[PDB]
From a paper:
Red fluorescent proteins with a large Stokes’ shift (LSSRFPs) are genetically encoded and have a large difference (approximately 100 nm) between the excitation and emission peaks. They efficiently absorb blue light and emit red fluorescence. Recently, based on the conventional bright mScarlet RFP, we developed the LSSRFP LSSmScarlet. In this study, using the previously reported LSSmScarlet LSSRFP as a template, we developed pH-, photo-, and chemically stable LSSRFPs, named LSSmScarlet2 and LSSmScarlet3.
The phenolic hydroxyl group of the chromophore makes two H-bonds with the side chain of the D147 residue and with one internal water molecule. The negative charge of the pair D147/phenolic hydroxyl group of the chromophore is balanced by the positively charged R198 residue, which is close to the phenolic group of the chromophore and forms a solvent water-mediated H-bond with D147. Similar to LSSmScarlet, we attributed the large Stokes’ shift found in LSSmScarlet2 to ESPT from the phenolic hydroxyl group of the chromophore to the –COOH side chain group of the D147 residue. There were six mutations in LSSmScarlet2 compared to LSSmScarlet: I74T, D170G, D177H, Q189L, Y215F, and G226D. I74T substitution results in the formation of a hydrogen bond with the S218 residue.
Residue numbers in the entry: 4 to 66, 71 to 226
The structure:
């Protein structure tokens, strides 16, 4: 059924189980958006291990690949994968040695997208900006994707804003795997900006917004 199945308005539910420097936690949330316009929002709640003793900015990019706008000539790998869906596998590596491995499953149940996330973060300095909660959101960035063996492989130069000024950098590498063969794009870029739009004081309830749009590279 493919893109037919992804409607101009879609809802999702998400659950994450994670650990950061051995601190176990869980998140549950729900979201919605306009998949063809590249916009979405989510409301997340900490359901275990709260209040989190680390930056929310580690978690925010783990909460939705059906919601990227494409120009007419770039086929949408993720939208085509439905109703079966897809998985992804990510490594984030930060300038001070922090490391995060993340896996995700995306399915569709009764017209709602279902996301299950598993996260493990290690090697964060206990007095660094992530474990001291001294970051201030993700800067806009670009994911360079290329096709290989029926999967997409992405690379991001990510930047977290520091409280008081400056940037805290990471590289993000992800493989995106449809559960059935789909029409492959060529190599292309996805430009993203993800904002935390509201939160309670202890970040046990958080809302975020993301705009995502695919484009060709010029070289």
């Amino acid at each position: 059924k493919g893109e037919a199945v992804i409607k101009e308005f879609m809802r999702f539910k998400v659950h994450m189980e994670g650990s950061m420097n051995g601190h176990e936690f869980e998140i549950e949330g729900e979201g919605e958006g306009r998949p063809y316009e590249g916009t979405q929002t989510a409301k997340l709640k900490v359901t275990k291990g709260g209040p989190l003793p680390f930056s929310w900015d580690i978690l925010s990019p783990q909460f939705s690949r059906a919601f990227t706008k494409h120009p007419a000539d770039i086929p949408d790998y993720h939208k085509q994968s439905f109703p079966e869906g897809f998985k992804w596998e990510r490594v984030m590596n930060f300038e001070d040695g922090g490391a995060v491995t993340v896996t995700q499953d995306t399915s569709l149940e009764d017209g709602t997208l279902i996301y299950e996330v598993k996260l493990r973060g290690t090697n964060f300095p206990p007095d660094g900006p992530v474990m001291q909660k001294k970051t201030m959101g993700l800067e806009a960035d670009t994911e360079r994707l290329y096709p290989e063996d029926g999967v997409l492989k992405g690379d991001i130069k990510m930047a977290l804003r520091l409280k008081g000024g400056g940037r805290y950098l990471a590289h993000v590498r992800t493989t995106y795997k449809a559960k059935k063969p789909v029409l492959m794009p060529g190599a292309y870029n996805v430009d993203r900006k993800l904002d935390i739009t509201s939160h309670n004081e202890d970040y046990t309830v958080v809302e975020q917004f993301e705009r995502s749009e695919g484009r060709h590279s010029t070289g």
